[PDB]
Every structure is written in C-alpha cells, then in structure tokens.
Design a protein around this nucleic acid. Structure first.
Ligand SMILES: Nc1ncnc2c1ncn2[C@@H]1O[C@H](COP(=O)(O)O)[C@@H](O)[C@H]1O
Ligand SMILES: Nc1ncnc2c1ncn2[C@@H]1O[C@H](COP(=O)(O)O)[C@@H](O)[C@H]1O
Lengths: 562, 562
RNA sequence: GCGCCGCUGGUGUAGUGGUAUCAUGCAAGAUUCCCAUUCUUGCGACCCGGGUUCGAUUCCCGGGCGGCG
RNA sequence: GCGCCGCUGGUGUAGUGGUAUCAUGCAAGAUUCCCAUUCUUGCGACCCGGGUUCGAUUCCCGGGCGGCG
C-alpha cells in the first residue's frame, strides 16, 4: 500500500542515501547517507538522547569499534558467528564440519585441513602491524559497556540500578545482504544496558506510561495462532502479560519514542519472546521487521568476562540488619604440612576443607590429649590449628540482572520512510515526506516568490535570523516557479516554508507567509517573529493547529509589482 | 607548568577515559570514553556542528568506515602506508625492499618471497565471508566525500562553491602508539571539504573575522628562525601573509571555534606549510601538537578517482558571453576505412586526427577533383567526408579547488584538558576543570546542603525542571559534606551548582544558591527561575559577571533547623 | 619493532617463597549546617601464561600494559 | 554461495557491430506573481575487465550491482 518503487526513486534522486562506493561499482550492504538522510539520522539520534539518556540520566560512554579476539571468544561470538568451510576448485563453497559428517573423501585448524586429505561473519583484522594480535570489528556495542562495568558502577557510587548506553556503528559480514537498509553489513546501533537488583523490579516512574494503549503480541497469542492485541500498559502488567513495571516502563517509553519520530502506532507492535523480553516491530512492505531488540543477559556477559579475566563483576548491597555467623573452620599451617608431605599435602588440603564442625571438634578433641590425629587415604601433628568465631556480614553481593534494548537506527529510519511517504492529489510527480517537525531534515524552507531582486534583502535577513535561532533551514532561490520550489522542498520533507511576496516588501509592517508541508495551508506573520514560531514548531512546543489558531490565514496577496 | 600526572589521575579516577579492554590487560592506542568524557565529546561535536555545518550551511554526509581496496589504491594510501617486510626466526622485523637493497642472502608478491631465497598501517580486512574482496578500515573520512561529489554538487544545484563535511572515526594501525590520546589507533575526525571556483577566491563573509588578532607562524618566520607573531587577520591577508580571504575566513572561524571550546588563545597558533595551507597547533606538555590539519587536494583525489572510474568529476559554469568557434575537422567513415584496411586503419585514424586545417582543405581540394588522396606510411577514397562549422560554447568545465580542514577531536579534547586543568589554593586535593559552559559535561550540579529529608522534594522538582529545560545536570545527594560534593562535582567540571539550604525550605518565596565553578562565588535566586538561568549560561547567552550583576550575592544563611 | 626500569584495592603505597600494611576513595550511622569537618563501622587489591618448588604475588622465562629514548 | 532476467544522462526510457532517441531534472534568459506555468537556449549517459572483430555500448565469457526464490 506504499509505492516502494516511487518512494525509492525519491530517496535516490534527492540523495537521502545511496549505494556506497557507487562510482566504483558499489558494495552490497554498504550505504552512504547524503545531506538529507544524514540530517535526519542526526535528528533521530538527538531525539533519542533527550528521550533515553537525558530523561533516565543514563551513563553514555564511547568505546572503540576495534576489538581483540579474546573478548569475542569469551562472549561467544567467535564460535557462534564463525568457523571454516571448504571450496570447490571452480566455485561452490560447502560447510566443513558438515561435509566431514556427510562422509567421503573430497569435492563433488590446518590439522583438519590435513585430515580432509584422506568463514566468519564478524569482520576479521589484525591490531598492530605484523599482526600478532588478531581482532574483529565489533558486531554490537554492548561489550564495551560490560567491560567498563566497574568504572560505571563506581561513577554511580556503587549503587543500583543504573544504565549505560552506547550509540555507534556495528558490523556484520553478512552472507547475502538484500532488503535495502534492513539487512546491511554496517549499521548504527543505539544500545542501552539497564542494570537492576533482581529484588527491586519495580519502576518508580511507571505511572507515566501506564495509560498508553499499545499493540502487544504475547507468546500465548503467537502459539495459539492469535493476533496481537491493544492493551492499556498498566493493565497488561497487572494481568501479568508483561511481567513487571521495569519492563513495562521501558516498553512505554520505547513506544513514545518510536511514535515521536514518525512511526505509525497502528503499524507498530511489541512481540514477546517465546520458549522476559518484548521486541518492537514495525509493519512495512517487507512485512513485520524488528527495529528494537530486547535481550536479557543476566548471568551471561558479566559472568563470562568475570570468569575469563578473573575480575569480579558484581554490585554490593548493604544489609539493613547485619547477619552474624558462627564459623568453625580448620586453620592448617601451609608451610608445616607442605614441607612434611609432597603431593600428599595437596590432597590433604583437598580434604581438610571438606569437613563438618562435628568432625572438626572431634579432631581437635583428639588433638588436645596430645597431640596428633590421622586421616583417610596421613598423620597430622601441630601443622593444624583449629578455629571458631563470630563473623558479621554488613553486605551481600548482588549479581545484577541486565535489560538490553537494542535500536537499529537504519531500520527505524527506513520505517519512518515507508510510514511518512506520500504522493499528492493530482500532480503525482509531487511526492512528500510527513516527517514530524522534531526530526525533519530542515525545519524551514526560505523562499522568495519570484526572482525579483527586492526580495533578496528579506531572504538574507530571514536566513541569518534562522541560523541565529539554531533553526536548520534551506533557502531555495532558484530560477523556477513557487510551485517547483515548493515541490522540491516538500520532496525532502521540509516541515515548513516561508514565502516572501510583494506584500512583504510593500506593506507597512513586514509580514511573510508560513506554509505547512502536509496541508499546504498557510498563515501570515511578521517576518521578525517567524524564526521563533518555526523554532516552537521544531521543538514540538506547539502544533500547526496551534499556529492557525493564533495567526491570520492566507487569503491572497493584496499587492503586486509597484 | 601543568601537573600532567595529577591531571591524569583525575581523568582516570573519574573515568573521563580509560584504556580500552583494560580488564583484559588493555590494548595500545585504544581508549574508551566514560560518562564525563563522552558527554564532553558530544558537546564539542555539537558545538562544532553549530559552528561549521550550520553557519556555512555545509552538506553533512555519513559514509561507511568499511572501504574496498581499489578505492584506497587509487587514493594512494595502499602504497604510501603499506608494503611487506621480513622477520627473523626469533623476533627482529626488518624492511624488505630495504634489506634487498642492503644485499646478502637472508637474516642476521610471493614471487619476491621466492626471490629472497637466493606490513600495512591501514587496518586490513575482507568484505563478504570467503574473502574474495579485500578492504580496509578507512584511515580518514574524506574519501566518502570525494566519491559522492556528483550527488553533492547536484544537491547544491550544480553551483559552486559548496562544502561537504563528515564526522566520524578513522583508523591507523600505528607502529608504537605513545603520547596518550595524541597518537592513537582509532580517533574521531571532523573533516570539511570546501569546493571552490579557483577564480572566485574571495569570501563574502571575511569581514566577520578580519578583526581577530591571531598568532600566525609563517613559513618565512620558520625558515628564518623566527617565532610566530600576532596579527590582525585582515592585515595578514592584505599584506599577503595569508594568500586569500577564503583561507583567512576559514582560519578565523577555526580560531573562534577552538577558543569557544576552551583552548587558550595564547597557546594556540596557525602554522603555515612550507616548501596555501595553515595548520592549527596548540601548545601542550608534549609541546606544539597539530589539532587541525589543512590540506589542498586540488588536482588530486577528484582526478584520481575520475581517472580510475572513468567518471568525470567536474563542476560546470555558464558563460556570461557564449564563445563561438570555427571547427575544421576530418569526418572519416569508420566502417569504410576499417573494412578496407586491417591494422592499417587504426594507424590511419591515429593520423587523420592530427592534422592542421590548412592540410585538411588541401586534402579536400585534392579530393573534389575526383576523388581520392593518399598519405604517409594509404590511398583514401570516399571513406572521408570533411567538415567545417560554427560551434558555440555556453559553458566552461571548472575543476574545483578543494580546502580540507581536518579536526582531531581527541587532540582537541586533550588540549582542553591541559588548558583548563587547575588545582585550588590550600586543599590541593581539590582539582577542577575550567570547561566553558557551552561544553561542560553537565551544566548544573543539584545538591542539598545536608542529608535532611525536607530537602528532597526541592531537589526532585528542581531535577525534573532541569530535564524539562533540556539542561544536563547531576544530582549529588550522597552522605558527605557540602564541601565533599562541591569537590566531586568541580572535579569533573560541572560549570554551576545549586545548593538547597534551610533558607530554601523556610523562607517565603523559595530561593536556592547558584555557585560558579571557577570562582566559587554565589548568588541567590527563586528556585523556579534557576533552570532558565543555568540554561542561558549553558547556551552562552549570558556570562557569570552578567549573573552577579542581576541577582543578590550570597551573604550567608538566615535560617537553620526549625 | 629495539633498548631502559616498573606493574599490589577505584587512586597511591607497605611488605612477603605459605593471600597482604597504611592512606585516600566510596558505602552506612551518627556529627556538622556553605566549601574533601570529625568519630565509629563496612567494601575493595598482588597484570596474564608457563617454568622451577610441596606451594609464587614474591625467583626465572615469555606475553600484555605503562614510563624513558 | 546457487538459480532466475536485467544494467544506456541525476531519474526513467528509444535504439544500435561504426558513440545514441525521447521524456524528466537541473542551468540560463524571458514569461508568470502562491502551489512541478509557458517559450527559447544549454548541461549530462551506453556498469567494469577479458575475448572474438578492422572496430563492441551491441555478440560471448567472467566479475560488480540490482530485482525474483
Ligand atoms: N544486518 C543488519 N542490518 C541492519 N540492522 C540490523 C542488522 N542486524 C541487526 N540489526 C538491528 O539491530 C537490532 C539488534 O539486533 P541483534 O543485535 O542482532 O539482536 C535489531 O533489532 C535491528 O534493528
Ligand atoms: N594517530 C592519531 N591519533 C590521534 N589523532 C590523529 C592521529 N593522526 C592524525 N590525527 C588528527 O587528525 C588530523 C589530521 O591528520 P592527517 O589526516 O594525518 O593529516 C590531525 O591534525 C590530528 O589532529
């Protein structure tokens, strides 16, 4: 129901984006974003920062894309995403472990290569030249957040919960990329890691989103061949469809964000993972695609890296009431025991630790009646002191649960394309994008009605004033009609237009016309006040309905050349 | 004169940045930026966008980091930055071409490897798995701008001048990185390509910067063992020290930018290239380091890529007055001539093109007296028509000159560190950063004077109000003294502080105290007005002197617990 | 790459062939009520691999990382 | 990877063993004076490598890129 072909022509022609290295014939899965697309991506990301990082006071960090092999071996990406296959003399690549299992001889480490005589989706490289340290381009931005967990917890003064975020590119050496921007080899990701006490799974700010009505696609609905269904968010948590208000909160603000940047609510749903994690999916001409992933990496990455580095990655919680504990434990001279016995005493300490307090005090009872006991599979003298004592714990070690919202900016952008792309009534040559003002490429088009020179002082002052207000704009003063210019600026989604006519130059206070992209409807206002108005529009402070409600609507020019 | 050690301790401790993959032992030349550093980098970049991209209406684009081999072969990076050497059985890597030239046999393509039996600084990888398409991580961000030149010129309606920019990471497989952030393997660059008619080398906006007084380090000053010297910018262009006002303009706004983000003017100079291009250099504890590069890639990249792709990369200018030209040229039947002769006729057209009009009309004069002539090193019949005619040119092809300002954000940031780092008088434990407000990590610290609970409603409303104003802040409500909190927030360069005391809770309208980081001086204002004030501070709309000039200064608390 | 010495809580340090001192920091409770206050209590560390040894943080070798060329 | 047909100005097309049609777009000058107006003039293209041929954009082979599995 979206003319994907027509839309793609507009995206290509106006250079929203294009095939990377196109003049060299191009490369699959690689794309350059041109002025308008890059402006859009930067607005989407800017909006994202104010949404998530600013509102939740999230700790943003910036790690390298370059990653050494061990890190991704520990995280399981090396085995999961990689192996090595065999190729036919003249094309026809086949899996190795596969064809080994299939059995025969050949065709149709290198120890295995020698064995036969009887491929990684991660981009691989080498750090330092000479290449003694192999590495990869990171396939996600999360690992950099896990590696810095101690530093990040310390910045938050050791307290939970907290969240870290990363906004940056990731790489995926894809087999055969199709689907335009949807399955690409390099893409910009926005990843949040929200660390929480597993016991404090309640969000204080959930009441902010409980009233939203969302399309939820439960696992039960999926198994039972049902369709997704609209629910009040609060109801969904209350009835247990969404497990808790931490998950719920995160869902609500994701929804608010996707809709804020122009994704249609009716072509947006949240799909539950089945045999807690919900994914944001949008409906496109390619069908339902995942735009926001969700993972729960509790007992996974922190643990792996902890085990691999021997660096304890854990939070630490104070106990309201300190627990005291009786401790009956053996206190063996390491020197004495190790000197008297040789491989013996390794096994003898392999043993003494594994003993009940009963056994222990029987042992020392045997030892105060001078002065030595003996044991299973060794005769111990006083190379063994014994010890009992009170031991108070003021703090318990908390292994944080992690929630991982993973945003694919490319898919989000493409989704915005399909959902905001339109053609006009009549002149179908005239296509436009309904980008919401907070993210449109430019806020304002600045245009004179005719090529007449009496216009240009007004255009310049106006352009200068807009730049002064930090309002991205674009002046279109070219040699054609108002209508050709309005077509060109609408085509790239410029949200508003300011036309400077004869009434601007001739009339007693200077007023120009402000035009809405979607409606083409206009109002008229003092040329010195319009920057602020466009500014309120771009900041989402006011609506177009709000503008029509405050200013005189356009009922024609009163003047002409004079 | 800067305690680099003390400063580095503060940068490490508060996690401005840290060694990448530190828990895995770390990797040289790779760094992660923590919350404060990442906040700073994002502000520097945001400021940069409003400076250059917005003010000059520059075309920002976003290309991939992944780059295929041919592109960098054509640009000369493959031969310049790469080769292949030989290694000793137990360490001791030596150049190849080198040791071949040195002569002997061995030690102390693969055709060469076989020959001996008698290293790239670019990060190398393979696109697609199976690896039939070798590539690199881009070492700069410029190539993506050159490859899209047609698309970018078209977006600017074929007209010159224009400028494209890119903000993104680049990679450099460095031999031995030292010098902290200064010589790293991955770094974020901000690159501008300004395309200009070589004949229109005058900037209309130069008068905006002509009054700046800058330290200029001319080539003549360098050769003649002189020091850099302060000059009025306009004077420098007028006296020919700086060739033109395009270069001059760009220098002035670079200066304004570097100073805007906190680089001391007195430890900032512009160094001319010697046997036009000036580089911005800042004075640090490592001495004078280059922070902004400048290149002139006129007749270089566009040409190379043009030659390699056979795609003409050129601007096109209309001629005020169309030139008419007489054209006397041979018009040879390709078929006739090629059928009658076999390798002969290649050489015969190798020839006919190379002939003067005199010779031509002598030839046709020989041919109208029926009906065939003959030539050096072949007898031509009517397989040769001849032709004269008027040929008007309405447009001349312009090969754009390019100016390339290349900003090293890491070096810029580090420079800001050394230039804004300070220790206080007395308590030297108390170090702070004089980040200018427009770029400080947070604008505002929100703090209560004591742990008393009557404070927390005020802190929350205030925090919420700040977020509503889009003001990055950080609430510090921890268990120590006002002074320990003010130390912690000063240490990371929080520009302002808002303390909520007993006078805030007890007194008839609610006012709190606003504190300047540098001076520690304070004023007192209504808690509902402070977000806007901090906002004006952060946007550079007002100074601290401006604040003291408007509000009551802090002369003590009037109330206490009650 | 080569050479020069190092690597102990988050930061800086003591010391050791038998798991470790002091300071700061942070956390908690008191105290204080405008500039790292004071007291009590608590958390947290021997860079990694191999070797010799009964056992290495300590001795040796090799990596990694840093400083000085 | 395999298979299925393609690739001609920025966009879309005509056609061809001897360098190419029309439209749009953009540029310029007129015209118009609020929604791709009209007229004139101008700019801009055969995806890349190899083969056969005197010569390939055209035929064949192989890449690259796209569509359909
Ligand atoms: N190959 C790709 N191209 C573009 N976007 C992707 C790609 N792979 C993943 N994504 C996006 O990144 C998110 C996280 O995916 P993953 O990390 O694979 O679970 C997804 O929800 C997508 O939006
Ligand atoms: N290895 C590096 N590490 C950090 N910054 C760099 C590095 N190389 C270059 N730069 C920065 O990038 C700018 C351009 O350098 P170049 O492209 O090498 O001329 C310089 O002025 C530096 O600020």
């Amino acid at each position: 129901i979206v003319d994907r072909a027509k839309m793609g022509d507009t995206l290509k022609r106006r250079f929203f984006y294009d095939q990377a290295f196109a003049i060299y014939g191009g490369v699959s899965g690689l794309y350059d974003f041109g002025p308008v697309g890059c402006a859009l991506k930067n607005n989407i990301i800017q909006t994202w920062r104010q949404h998530f990082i600013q509102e939740e006071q999230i700790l943003e960090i910036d790690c390298t894309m370059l990653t050494p092999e061990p890190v991704l071996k520990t995280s399981g990406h090396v085995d999961k995403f990689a192996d090595f296959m065999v190729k036919d003399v003249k094309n026809g690549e086949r899996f190795r472990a596969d064809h080994l299992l299939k059995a025969h001889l050949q065709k149709l480490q290198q120890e295995l290569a020698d064995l036969f005589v009887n491929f990684n989706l991660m981009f691989k490289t080498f750090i330092g030249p000479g290449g003694n340290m192999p590495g990869y381009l990171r396939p996600e931005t999360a690992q950099g957040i896990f590696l810095n967990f101690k530093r990040l917890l310390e910045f938050n003064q050791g307290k939970l919960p907290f969240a870290a975020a990363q906004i940056g590119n990731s790489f995926r050496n894809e087999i055969s990329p199709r689907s335009g921007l949807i399955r690409v080899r390099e893409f910009t990701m926005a990843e949040i890691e929200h660390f929480v006490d597993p016991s404090e799974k309640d969000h204080p700010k959930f009441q902010n989103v409980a009233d939203l009505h969302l399309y939820l696609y439960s696992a039960k609905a999926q198994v039972s061949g049902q369709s997704a269904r609209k629910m009040r968010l609060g109801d969904a948590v209350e009835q247990g469809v969404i497990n808790n208000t931490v998950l719920g909160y995160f869902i609500g603000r994701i929804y608010l964000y996707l809709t804020k940047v122009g994704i249609s609510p009716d072509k947006l749903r949240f799909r539950q993972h089945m045999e807690d994690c919900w994914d944001a999916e949008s409906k496109t001409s390619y069908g339902w695609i995942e735009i926001v992933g969700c993972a729960d990496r509790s007992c996974y990455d922190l643990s792996c890296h902890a085990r691999a580095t021997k660096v304890p990655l854990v939070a630490e919680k104070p106990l309201k009431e300190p627990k005291t504990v009786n401790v009956v434990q053996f206190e063996p001279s390491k020197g004495a025991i190790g000197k008297a016995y040789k491989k013996d005493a390794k096994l003898v300490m392999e043993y003494l630790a594994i003993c009940d307090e009963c056994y222990i005090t029987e042992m020392e009872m045997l030892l105060n009646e001078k002065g030595e006991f003996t044991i299973e599979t060794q005769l111990t003298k006083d190379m063994i002191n014994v010890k009992r004592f009170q031991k108070t714990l003021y703090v318990e070690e908390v292994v944080p649960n992690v929630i991982e919202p993973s945003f694919g900016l490319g898919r989000i952008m493409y989704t915005v394309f399909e959902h905001t792309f339109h053609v006009r009534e009549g002149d179908e040559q005239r296509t436009f994008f309904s980008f919401p003002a907070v993210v449109a490429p430019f806020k304002c088009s600045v245009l004179p009605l005719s090529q007449n020179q009496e216009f240009m002082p007004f255009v310049k002052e106006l352009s200068e004033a807009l730049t002064r207000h930090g309002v991205s704009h674009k002046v279109d003063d070219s040699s054609g009609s108002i209508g050709r210019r309005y077509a060109r600026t609408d085509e790239i989604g410029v949200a508003f237009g300011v036309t400077i006519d004869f009434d601007t130059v001739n009339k007693t206070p200077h007023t120009a016309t402000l035009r809405d992209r979607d409606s083409m409807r206009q109002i008229r206002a003092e040329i010195s006040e319009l920057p602020s108005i466009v500014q309120d529009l771009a900041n989402g402070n006011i609506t177009w309905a709000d503008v029509e409600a405050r200013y005189p609507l356009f009922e024609g020019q009163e003047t002409g050349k004079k």
